[PDB]
Amino acid sequence: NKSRQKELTRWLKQQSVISQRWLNISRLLGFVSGILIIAQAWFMARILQHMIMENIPREALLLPFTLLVLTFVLRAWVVWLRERVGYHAGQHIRFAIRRQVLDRLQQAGPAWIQGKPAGSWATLVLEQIDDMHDYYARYLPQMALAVSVPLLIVVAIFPSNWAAALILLGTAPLIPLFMALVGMGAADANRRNFLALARLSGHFLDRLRGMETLRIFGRGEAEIESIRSASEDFRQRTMEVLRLAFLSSGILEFFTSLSIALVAVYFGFSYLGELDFGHYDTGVTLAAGFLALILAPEFFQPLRDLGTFYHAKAQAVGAADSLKTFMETPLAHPQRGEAELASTDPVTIEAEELFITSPEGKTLAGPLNFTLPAGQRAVLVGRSGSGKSSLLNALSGFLSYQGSLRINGIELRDLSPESWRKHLSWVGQNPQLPAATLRDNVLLARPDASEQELQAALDNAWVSEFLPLLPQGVDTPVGDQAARLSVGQAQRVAVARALLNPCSLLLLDEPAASLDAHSEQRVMEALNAASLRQTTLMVTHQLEDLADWDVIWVMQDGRIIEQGRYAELSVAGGPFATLLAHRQEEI
Amino acid sequence: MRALLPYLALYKRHKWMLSLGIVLAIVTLLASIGLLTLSGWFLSASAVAGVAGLYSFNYMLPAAGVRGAAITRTAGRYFERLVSHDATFRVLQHLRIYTFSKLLPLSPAGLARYRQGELLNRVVADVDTLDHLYLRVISPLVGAFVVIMVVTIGLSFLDFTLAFTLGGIMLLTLFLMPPLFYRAGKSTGQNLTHLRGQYRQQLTAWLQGQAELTIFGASDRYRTQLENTEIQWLEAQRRQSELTALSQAIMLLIGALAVILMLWMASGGVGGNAQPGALIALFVFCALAAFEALAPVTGAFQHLGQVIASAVRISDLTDQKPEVTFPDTQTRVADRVSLTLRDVQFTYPEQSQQALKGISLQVNAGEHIAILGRTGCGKSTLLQQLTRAWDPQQGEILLNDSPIASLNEAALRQTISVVPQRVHLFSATLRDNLLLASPGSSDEALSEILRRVGLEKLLEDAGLNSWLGEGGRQLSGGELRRLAIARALLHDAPLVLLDEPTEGLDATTESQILELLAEMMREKTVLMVTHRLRGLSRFQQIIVMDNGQIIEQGTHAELLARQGRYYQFKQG
Numbered sequence A: 001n002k003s004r005q006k007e008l009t010r011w012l013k014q015q016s017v018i019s020q021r022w023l024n025i026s027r028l029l030g031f032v033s034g035i036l037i038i039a040q041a042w043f044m045a046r047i048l049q050h051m052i053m054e055n056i057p058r059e060a061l062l063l064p065f066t067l068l069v070l071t072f073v074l075r076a077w078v079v080w081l082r083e084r085v086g087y088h089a090g091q092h093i094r095f096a097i098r099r100q101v102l103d104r105l106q107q108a109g110p111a112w113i114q115g116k117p118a119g120s121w122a123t124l125v126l127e128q129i130d131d132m133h134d135y136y137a138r139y140l141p142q143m144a145l146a147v148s149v150p151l152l153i154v155v156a157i158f159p160s161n162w163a164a165a166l167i168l169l170g171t172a173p174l175i176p177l178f179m180a181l182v183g184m185g186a187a188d189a190n191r192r193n194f195l196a197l198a199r200l201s202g203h204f205l206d207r208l209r210g211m212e213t214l215r216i217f218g219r220g221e222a223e224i225e226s227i228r229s230a231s232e233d234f235r236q237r238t239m240e241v242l243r244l245a246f247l248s249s250g251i252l253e254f255f256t257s258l259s260i261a262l263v264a265v266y267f268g269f270s271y272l273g274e275l276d277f278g279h280y281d282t283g284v285t286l287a288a289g290f291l292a293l294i295l296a297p298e299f300f301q302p303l304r305d306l307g308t309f310y311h312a313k314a315q316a317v318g319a320a321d322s323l324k325t326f327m328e329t330p331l332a333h334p335q336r337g338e339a340e341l342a343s344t345d346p347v348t349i350e351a352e353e354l355f356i357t358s359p360e361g362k363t364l365a366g367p368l369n370f371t372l373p374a375g376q377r378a379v380l381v382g383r384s385g386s387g388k389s390s391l392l393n394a395l396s397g398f399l400s401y402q403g404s405l406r407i408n409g410i411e412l413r414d415l416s417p418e419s420w421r422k423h424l425s426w427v428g429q430n431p432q433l434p435a436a437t438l439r440d441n442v443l444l445a446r447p448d449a450s451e452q453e454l455q456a457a458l459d460n461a462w463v464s465e466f467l468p469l470l471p472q473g474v475d476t477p478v479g480d481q482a483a484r485l486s487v488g489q490a491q492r493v494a495v496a497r498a499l500l501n502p503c504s505l506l507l508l509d510e511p512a513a514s515l516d517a518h519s520e521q522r523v524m525e526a527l528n529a530a531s532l533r534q535t536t537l538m539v540t541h542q543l544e545d546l547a548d549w550d551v552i553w554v555m556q557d558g559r560i561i562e563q564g565r566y567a568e569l570s571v572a573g574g575p576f577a578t579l580l581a582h583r584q585e586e587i
Numbered sequence B: 001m002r003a004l005l006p007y008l009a010l011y012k013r014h015k016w017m018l019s020l021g022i023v024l025a026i027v028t029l030l031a032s033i034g035l036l037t038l039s040g041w042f043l044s045a046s047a048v049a050g051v052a053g054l055y056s057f058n059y060m061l062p063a064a065g066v067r068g069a070a071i072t073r074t075a076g077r078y079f080e081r082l083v084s085h086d087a088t089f090r091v092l093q094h095l096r097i098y099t100f101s102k103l104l105p106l107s108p109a110g111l112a113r114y115r116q117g118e119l120l121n122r123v124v125a126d127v128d129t130l131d132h133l134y135l136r137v138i139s140p141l142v143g144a145f146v147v148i149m150v151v152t153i154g155l156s157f158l159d160f161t162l163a164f165t166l167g168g169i170m171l172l173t174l175f176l177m178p179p180l181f182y183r184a185g186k187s188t189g190q191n192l193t194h195l196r197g198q199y200r201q202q203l204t205a206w207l208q209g210q211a212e213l214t215i216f217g218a219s220d221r222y223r224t225q226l227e228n229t230e231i232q233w234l235e236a237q238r239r240q241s242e243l244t245a246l247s248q249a250i251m252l253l254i255g256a257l258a259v260i261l262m263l264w265m266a267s268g269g270v271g272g273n274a275q276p277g278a279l280i281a282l283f284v285f286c287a288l289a290a291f292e293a294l295a296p297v298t299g300a301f302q303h304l305g306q307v308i309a310s311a312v313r314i315s316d317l318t319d320q321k322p323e324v325t326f327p328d329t330q331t332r333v334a335d336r337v338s339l340t341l342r343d344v345q346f347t348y349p350e351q352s353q354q355a356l357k358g359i360s361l362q363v364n365a366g367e368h369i370a371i372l373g374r375t376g377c378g379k380s381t382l383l384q385q386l387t388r389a390w391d392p393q394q395g396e397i398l399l400n401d402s403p404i405a406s407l408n409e410a411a412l413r414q415t416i417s418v419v420p421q422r423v424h425l426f427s428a429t430l431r432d433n434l435l436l437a438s439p440g441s442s443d444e445a446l447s448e449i450l451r452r453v454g455l456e457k458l459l460e461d462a463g464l465n466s467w468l469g470e471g472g473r474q475l476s477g478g479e480l481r482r483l484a485i486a487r488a489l490l491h492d493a494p495l496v497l498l499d500e501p502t503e504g505l506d507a508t509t510e511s512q513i514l515e516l517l518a519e520m521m522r523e524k525t526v527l528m529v530t531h532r533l534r535g536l537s538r539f540q541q542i543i544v545m546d547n548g549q550i551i552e553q554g555t556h557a558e559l560l561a562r563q564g565r566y567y568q569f570k571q572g
């Protein structure tokens, strides 16, 4: 435990260099804040002595009032100023970590993003980067107010009285000692109840989630007593933990009120002839007692606020626990290049000893050898898990390959991604519509298109035949949270978006996989008349009526084992016969 | 504030504990104010008396006063934090039970218009934010009011005008400042939660559509508008720190006005005597120490706004009406049930496309039917009409030629046995994960079913007592499915509904489950909803679904005889 937590804190300190100018103004204003606390305590003590001891009227103390008001006004400005600089320090770190997380996720690409659910990433970017704010905004500026301010009170009281400065300084080594004695007892209760408490925290969300299962078994009424008897256990276990947690806090409030009690008694008796010790021989002064009394509660306030801001350290290292591992993963990714393809003609694809490698480093496809001349459409057939879609991710630029993969004779890894993708267009297995409306998704390839060629895209893909079904027509905000489109309807939009622009290579990936009968024959017909206009690489399961496709590749564990026209593979015995004749079709 | 009323009813239970926790927050907070007020007077009285009159001055009485006042704020704060948190934890149990009980009658229907992954994480946070209305909003605001009072009456004996202008200033800020800051930040808090969920909506669609955005050259156009939302979002966050900074600075210019006033005003005589002497300190130091009562108050405007949002957000989720209405006729559960459907239609709420166009389906008793379809055809929507998650708008559903809507819920749950598509593994022990199927079963009764379905590996190393859930042993996907069947077997019901029982399984365990379902459920009617084609020969009829319709129907051999969609399933 202590090994990692030391490594995480150095990560937080590394990020604090971003906005180090404002973490210094917060530290500088914290010193100035502790000066105005002393100035007003001195001004009040000198005002109060004049009007209490020598009975000077309030109308003769106009100068100390004027300076006392100004100190109070300055104090309020610094507190207002210090909060804003603390937030500014906090948000630069969050704004810059979020850019490093989003830059890392964009460069890693869809190959790595698909490893975790979109809500698992959205917790990293929203919840766990916003958890680091109160470490840099509150806790770090307070850990510097807790060491500067309390020393200013001691340094400002020592000239007037060395015992008053010793009452406050005598509890400086007592609080950490006593806070650790209760820590030994707390670790006994914390560790005994650690397994059960973490076991009972996720209880209510576990009954709330999967409330369907309680419904279908008629156990919704008997699980009220499970929530009742898991909240009695949670309360009793956590109160025995909290009897020691509030005792550690109470140490500060014990010495907070003992330090105001001793100052009151020592000064109170010093004015009565008793307790002559503790003060330099010049004499005892009422204003030297007011100054110490006003400043005694303010000695512990920086150390009391720090108690409330300490939770911000735990939730910033837990945030750093999962943010450090995110930024430390090797994540080898495809090499970017500068060369680009001038011609918009269909490309020639040939691969020699091509190996596709996962972002973590393992190989997803083995030694692939294939050649696809310009204008020729190939089709990928194989068993599930054979590396069919890994070849389509490599051609897309989403995966890193160690072998050779050439586009028009130019190596793919030496081809600039931002220009290669302008010659690339495919339809995936699942319709992913990331634009706001239905028209924004279709025009996602070229948003500055007129209605003529927008209306052509919809009719060519039969997106316009279900438009009357939709409420707002072509401008309907689409999604699972608004105007759900069936998988057949959303796949026709993904086809319409892919065919909007002419391309060089079309990497259709199992488009008619999960569709109803009508949309399957509307998607496939549109993509059968679209695969001709440029070199096309399709992967599919329905290998019947696949004769018109020129060359058929069969994949096995990551190798293209058989190739050629459908007629030559169908009649001849081989792995394609195994796929076709053994028409199990498990799904 | 009217939406905060349903949960204040929950607070009425355990009012004693909540009242005692507030009372200890006043005794502690009066001891804090009294320690400094008495110390300031003791220092002033000792200094005025001087060395002369050592025995004349009654220093023992304040000395025991400053000792008692110091102890009762160290100990009072200890028990204030215990009773407040203990009372909060009891209300949390009532809030969790109230929220759960108001969500069961609409568990699959009222929660289907949200994204259930992030909805229930928000519900749990909404209950936790409601549970802290007492600690963050009620205990300070109510504890500050009755300290401003005791101080006001307490100081009214020495001088009325000073106590009324210190208590008056303190009362004004207590009653006027939280409302003016809750009003000032009301728009921002609405903007903050709207821009937060917009950034989550734009980020999730940026990550999910990253393959499509990158190819179509929109990954940077859609990141710019994602980063412009964050700029808008961070601006809303910045304006909340301009109300946290302003309220923290204003409360310091008010605690400064009440010290300048008790210096100027209490130096013109406290009561009768023009030269009060020690009395000036007792008023300046009271005004100095009395504004720690309002220190919790300066943040209670931010916490009240959050609790109100949670109160509204929880309420409009649980204040909507259940889709289905279960009668109370108290019928008896049949021994064998036959399923009949006639033209069942159902459009999901807030949708314009029919999920179930029309379903005609006859399932006699002791008959094994299979439903085939691709993704999103509507088959798992059909199973939720049979368990009465929704009500078909047009169509009639029959059990033994008696309408399914005429069965009381306690009888319907004993007629229908269902294994869901998404098997839920409860956190509780392995025995408790099975005892929800049948509470009255014995440990040996649980064991025989557990080892019969192939889950004998769960019967070792305190197997029947292993935690087996979140924060414990996690079952594999194949083992989890066998657990669902183990509940359907224990919960003996005439009709058994299956929802992709063999999804995502290798043929080895797919065969084991399929052969387990045909032999155990031989005498019980089965309506299995399948996305695969393996082992469908043992079913008396196979019903192929397509886009909410029954396109084909008939026995397995009959379906192959006539060319159709089922033929296209095997041969592409």
Ligand SMILES: Nc1ncnc2c1ncn2[C@@H]1O[C@H](COP(=O)(O)OP(=O)(O)OP(=O)(O)O)[C@@H](O)[C@H]1O
Pocket (backbone or CB within 6 Å): A111, A112, A114, A115, A358, A359, A360, A363, A364, A365, A383, A384, A385, A386, A387, A388, A389, A390, A391
């Ligand atoms: N992003 C990834 N990171 C790590 N491993 C992966 C990743 N994507 C795929 N794999 C693994 O590498 C292998 C490549 O198989 P691939 O996903 O290409 O099969 P497939 O042709 O898509 O089959 P199907 O189309 O039926 O899913 C798989 O076994 C998979 O488990």
Ligand SMILES: Nc1ncnc2c1ncn2[C@@H]1O[C@H](COP(=O)(O)OP(=O)(O)O)[C@@H](O)[C@H]1O
Pocket (backbone or CB within 6 Å): A484, A485, A486, A487, B112, B113, B348, B349, B351, B355, B373, B374, B375, B376, B377, B378, B379, B380, B381, B382
């Ligand atoms: N909560 C919901 N609200 C609106 N529409 C839904 C909801 N759940 C599912 N649908 C839609 O209903 C159709 C059928 O859903 P469902 O029966 O869950 O799929 P399947 O039949 O594959 O299990 C799907 O196309 C889906 O888009």
Ligand SMILES: O=[P-]([O-])[O-]
Pocket (backbone or CB within 6 Å): B374, B375, B376, B380, B421, B531
């Ligand atoms: O959509 P899924 O339940 O097949």
Ligand SMILES: [Mg+2]
Pocket (backbone or CB within 6 Å): A388, A389, A390
């Ligand atoms: Mg694939």
Ligand SMILES: [Mg+2]
Pocket (backbone or CB within 6 Å): B379, B380, B381, B421, B499
């Ligand atoms: Mg389903």
